[PDB]
């Protein structure tokens, strides 16, 4: 959303005018980050952790 | 006073989310004039989005003329390693 | 044999981080459930229902030889029964918030409070989706991990498995402390039912109502512009056309209609609902839906018994956890009496009818003593033992009474 | 009795449904730490299979369980756990028959 404006002094009886909330917009994109790891099977048994 | 086509309301409009998103599912390229009528380019401002072809699911699928394996229709980037 | 048990339990996972693991649950995967739970529509009302179905109906504790317990608690005679009934007086609140939550969530999770001065305040339940156990290689849980929201991200902190307490519905197996959601085990019938109703809806939009096709021009004749359709557009507009306007026109304007293109959404609807009912366990009858030849005769007393089961499986299996885990350390912990005790905790049938518990005592009521009548009929049992303990009624023992 | 088995109808319906899906439910007994009777303990009837003799009797059983990236596996003897079968290919039968698998073909063409 737009910023908070003000309002303008207003004859009596006169058309008020239009200063209407206005938008625009912030893209994403989203990048893919990867990891990874391989361990054996004879690896993952012997390890005392 | 605003119309929902008026450059400011653009954002407000659900279609406008919905109808970019399907214009980036729908490309094979950047190249929108190949793609997009322009009533679509002007009406959804898909210069802005970043249409480029590689949020298409039919990218990333198999299709070879000949499948005895039934690989056709897998999705590379539902693999294992991706 | 032994103190400790050696079969193993297939059950590791995790640490800090999240993973795929399988056998535990993520707090996005809690924190589905609670989109489930209240997104809203015809799923939730189903899982609601199922909620008020097994533990709608309310509960009463029993103590078995309760009397023999009559004990001094603050200068006043007080039993077992007695004191849990002021310990816990909203427990029928409690066992349908608890039990429905326990129903949605793998498990029920909550505290045991103290007031001030250190006498029992509540067991006050906490919120499923934020809370998560850690369990050993032998199977047992030993931490809760808690996740909760604050203003854009996210607190954490981790409990010991002593001062909370849980109970768990549905299992994987029998050996199992953690169970499963319901919710997640049928997630693709849920998605099912969901893309169907949004590919109805749709379809309803476009097809369930006819079209306009206005047709300008002679077949092989002049050829029509836009900027010519834009006047014709204008005379047949349906925003300012009304029920009995009429057109007068030339031969070579034709007013050709797309007819609303039938299709059975009402059978896609029973469909998914069959579908949904029957992967939730509930009759299709809590859908809405109805059915052939199931309504009536033996097909219904089968459905119905099922049903009836069902429940009274859930409800045997909150009970024991409920008494063990959260009303035996309240007893033991802020309470003069024997925790020991054979505590029961049982929970009403949702589907019993008083007419037929009434026809059954007028004919066999010959055979129960007044208290046994008195706990099927759901009074409160006679104030005096003796007339309690006898078989034929206090109506007839106090006119044989009058007769003496 | 009543005593050592206070929650009877729940074990009862747990061992009784997994005797349905599995060949077998399969258990322990377990003691308290002074050596008085604790419980009938289920385990869980995937990771375990029997292994048996010549005259079809079980002597040993095998367990295999799920933990990070792979499996532990180990033997147990006949003497300490107990079992149940209520779906037998003979009288004889003391390992029993799954009725998922015997009508595996029924649940594909179901599924499929
Ligand atoms: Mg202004
Ligand atoms: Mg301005
Ligand atoms: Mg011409």
Redesign the pocket.
């Known amino acids: 959303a737009?910023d908070e404006?003000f309002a303008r002094p207003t004859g009596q009886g006169a058309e008020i005018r239009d200063?209407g909330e206005?938008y625009t917009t912030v893209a994403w994109n989203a990048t893919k980050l990867t990891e990874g790891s391989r361990v054996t099977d004879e690896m993952r048994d012997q390890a005392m952790v | 006073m605003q119309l929902r086509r008026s450059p400011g309301m653009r954002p407000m409009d659900r279609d406008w989310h919905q109808e970019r998103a399907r214009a980036r599912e729908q490309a094979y390229s950047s190249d929108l004039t190949s793609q997009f009528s322009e009533s679509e380019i002007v009406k959804y401002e898909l210069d802005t989005a970043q249409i480029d072809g590689s949020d298409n699911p039919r990218t990333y699928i198999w299709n070879r003329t000949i499948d005895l394996f039934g690989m056709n229709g897998t999705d590379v980037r539902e693999l294992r390693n991706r | 044999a032994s103190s400790t048990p050696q079969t193993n339990v297939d059950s590791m996972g995790g640490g800090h981080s999240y993973q795929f693991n399988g056998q535990d649950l993520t707090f996005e995967d809690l924190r589905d459930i609670k989109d489930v739970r209240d997104s809203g529509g015809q799923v939730a009302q189903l899982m609601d229902y199922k909620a008020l179905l097994n533990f709608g109906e309310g509960c009463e504790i029993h103590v078995e030889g309760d009397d023999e317990t009559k004990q001094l608690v603050d200068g006043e005679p007080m039993t077992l029964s007695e004191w849990l009934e002021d310990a816990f007086p909203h427990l029928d609140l409690l066992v349908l918030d608890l039990g429905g939550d326990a129903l949605w969530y793998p498990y029920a999770v909550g505290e045991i409070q103290e007031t001030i001065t250190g006498e029992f305040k509540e067991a006050l339940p906490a919120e499923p989706w934020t809370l998560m156990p850690e369990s050993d290689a032998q199977g047992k849980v030993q931490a809760w991990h808690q996740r909760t929201k604050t203003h854009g991200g996210y607190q954490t902190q981790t409990l010991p498995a002593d001062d909370l307490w849980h109970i768990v519905i549905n299992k994987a197996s029998a050996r199992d402390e953690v169970g499963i959601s319901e919710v997640l085990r049928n997630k693709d019938e849920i998605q099912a039912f969901k893309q169907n109703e949004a590919a109805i809806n749709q379809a309803i939009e476009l097809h369930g109502f006819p079209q306009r096709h206005v047709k300008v021009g002679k077949e092989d004749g002049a050829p029509v512009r836009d900027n010519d359709l834009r006047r014709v557009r204008t005379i047949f507009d349906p925003r300012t056309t009304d029920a009995n306007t009429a057109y007068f026109t030339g031969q070579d304007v034709d007013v050709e209609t797309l007819e609303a293109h039938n299709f059975d959404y009402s059978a896609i609807h029973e469909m998914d609902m069959r579908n949904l009912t029957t992967a939730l366990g509930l009759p299709l009858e809590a859908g809405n839906v109805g059915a052939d030849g199931l309504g009536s005769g033996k097909p219904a007393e089968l459905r119905f018994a099922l049903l009836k089961l069902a429940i009274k499986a859930n409800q045997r299996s909150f009970s024991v956890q409920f008494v063990e885990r959260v009303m035996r350390p309240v007893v033991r912990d802020y309470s003069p009496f024997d925790h020991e005790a054979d505590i029961r905790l049982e929970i009403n049938d949702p589907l019993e009818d008083i007419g037929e518990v009434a026809d059954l005592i007028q004919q066999v009521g010959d055979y129960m003593t007044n208290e046994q009548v008195a706990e099927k009929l759901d009074l409160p049992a006679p104030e005096d033992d003796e007339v309690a303990d006898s078989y034929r009624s206090p109506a007839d023992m106090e006119k044989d009474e009058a007769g003496v």
Do not use: C
């Open positions: 737009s404006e200063d206005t």
